[PDB]
Structure 1
Amino acid sequence: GAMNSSNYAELFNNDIKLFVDDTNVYRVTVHKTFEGNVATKAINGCIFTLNPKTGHLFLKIIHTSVWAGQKRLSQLAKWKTAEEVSALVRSLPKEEQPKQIIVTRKAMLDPLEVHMLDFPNIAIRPTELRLPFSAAMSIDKLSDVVMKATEPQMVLFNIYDDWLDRISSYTAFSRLTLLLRALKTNEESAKMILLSDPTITIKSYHLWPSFTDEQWITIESQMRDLILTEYGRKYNV
C-alpha cells in the first residue's frame, strides 16, 4: 500500500518507479487590489517527476495560461498533474514505463488512478515519508527554466548530476533529500553553504557544485547542523 522507512530500499531496486510531487504545480502571489480587497496572481509552476534510482527528472513546466478562465484551481492542479504524468507514461516506450508511481500527497491518488485506468499494471501508491520535493524551486537552474517559460514545456534533468559514477542511488537519494530538507528549512543558510567557496563551480550541464568526496562530507555535515538548529528554534528545545 503506502511507502515508508520499513520498505525504504524498494526505491533503489530495478522496478522502474517515479515519485510525483504536485506542490509547485499551482503557484500564486497574494496582493491587495486598488479597492483594498485581496487577489491572487498565478506564476509558472512545475510537476516534479523523479526516478529515484536513475535521478532522471521529468520537469513539466506549468505555464500560467493553463489556468486562464478556469475555476477551483487547487482542485484542477491535481487533475492537470495526473493528466501530464499519464501523457508522460504514454510517451515512454513500454520497457521505460514505471511499474509504480508514488505521489507525495494522498490528494493525488484518485486523480492519477483515474487518468491511468488504461494502465491497470501500474501501481499508484502514497507515502508516509515527508519528502522535501517542495524545495525543488530553491534549485537555481530549475527555478530559472520555470520562470522564463512562455509556453508549456517538458525539460529533462539528472537531479544527481554525475554522483552515481561515485556513489549508489541510496546514497545519492539521501544526499538529495538532505540538500532539499536544508533548502526548505532555511533557503538562505542552505544556499550560502553550497556556494561559499567560489573556487567550487557548478558545471554548465549540472545543478549542484562539483564537490570532491571529502568536500561533500563537509557540506553534508553543514546541512545537518543547519537542520538541527532551525528545529531547536522552531520548537524552543
Structure 2
Amino acid sequence: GAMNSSNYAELFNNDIKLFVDDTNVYRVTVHKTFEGNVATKAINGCIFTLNPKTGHLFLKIIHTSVWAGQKRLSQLAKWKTAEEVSALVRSLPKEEQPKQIIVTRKAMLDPLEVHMLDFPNIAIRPTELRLPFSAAMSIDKLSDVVMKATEPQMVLFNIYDDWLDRISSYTAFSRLTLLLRALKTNEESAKMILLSDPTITIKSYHLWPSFTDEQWITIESQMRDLILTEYGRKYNV
C-alpha cells in the first residue's frame, strides 16, 4: 500500500520501481489584465519520473501547447501525467517495466490506475513521505531544458551523476532528498552552498558539482544547517 518510513528500504531493493511527481506539470504565472482582471499564462512544465535505485530521471517536458484550448487544466494535468507515464511504461522492454509506481500526490492515484488498467500487475502506490521533488526545477540544467523546449520532449538524466560508483542507492537518495529539500526551503542559500567554491565544477554530463567524499560531508552538513536555520527563521526558534 502506502510508502512510508517503516518500509523505506524497499526503495532500494531489486524490484524495479518509479516515483512519479506531477507538481511541475502545469505551471503558470498569474498576472493582471489591461482591464484589471487576473489571468494566467502557462509556462513549460515537466513530469518527474525517477528510478530511486538507479538515479534514472525520465524527464518528460510538457510544452504549453498541450494546454491550448483545454479546460480545467489542473485536472487535465493529472490525466496528462498519467497518460505520459503509461506511454513511458509501454515504451520500455518488459524486463525494464516497473513493478510499482509510487505517486508523490494522492490525486495521481486514480488517473494513473485508470491509464494502467492494461498493467494489472503494476502496483500504483501513494506515499506518506513529503518528498521534495517539486524543487527539481531548481536544478539549473533541468530548468534550462524545460524552459528552452519548443515542443514535447523526453530528456534523460542520471539525477545521481556518478555517485553510485562510490555510495549505495540508499545514501544517494538521502543526499538527493537533502539537496532538494534545501533548494525548496531556501533556493538562493542552497545554490550559494553548492557553487560558492569556483574550483569545484559541474561536469558537462552531470547535474551537481564534482565533490570529493570529504566535500560531500561538508556540503551535506551545510544543507542540514540551512534547513534547520530556515526552520528557525520561519518559526522563530
TM-score normalised per structure 1: 1.00
* Runs of 4+ residues deviating >3 angstroms: none
The number of equivalent residue pairs is: 237
In structure 1, stretches of 5+ residues that fail to align are none
Offset from partner CA, 1:141-160 (integer Å, 9 cap, x none):
00000000000000000000
Q: What TM-score does the superposition give when structure 2 sets the normalisation length? A: 1.00
- Match in the other structure for 1:68: 68
For 1:30 and 1:88, locate their aligned partners in 2 and report how far apart those are by CA, in whole Å. 31
Partner residue in 1 for 2:139: 139
Shift in Å, 1:235: 1.4
Cα deviation code 1:26-73 (max 9, x no counterpart): 000000000010000000000000000000000000000000000000
Q: Report the CA distance between 1:102 and its aligned residue.
A: 0.1
Aligned to 2:79: 79
* CA-to-aligned-CA distance 1:200-221 (integer Å, 9 cap, x gap): 0000000000000000000000
**C-alpha distance in 1 between matches for 2:82 and 2:7:** 25
SS at match of 1:8: helix
1:234 to partner: Cα distance: 1.2
Residue in 1 that maps onto 2:123: 123
Give 1:77 deviation, angstroms: 0.2
- Deviation of 1:123 after TM superposition, in Å, equals 0.1
Q: Give the RMSD, CA atoms, in angstroms.
A: 0.3
Tell me the SS of whatever aligns to 2:182. helix
- Helix, strand or coil: the match of 2:3? coil
Q: CA deviation at 1:232?
A: 1.0
Cα distance in 2 for partners of 1:38, 1:146 equals: 25
Name the CA distance, whole Å, in 2 between partners of 1:236 and 1:228. 11
2:104 alignment partner in structure 1:
104
Indicate the SS of the match to 2:76.
Answer: helix
Q: What is the SS of the residue equivalent to 2:39?
A: strand
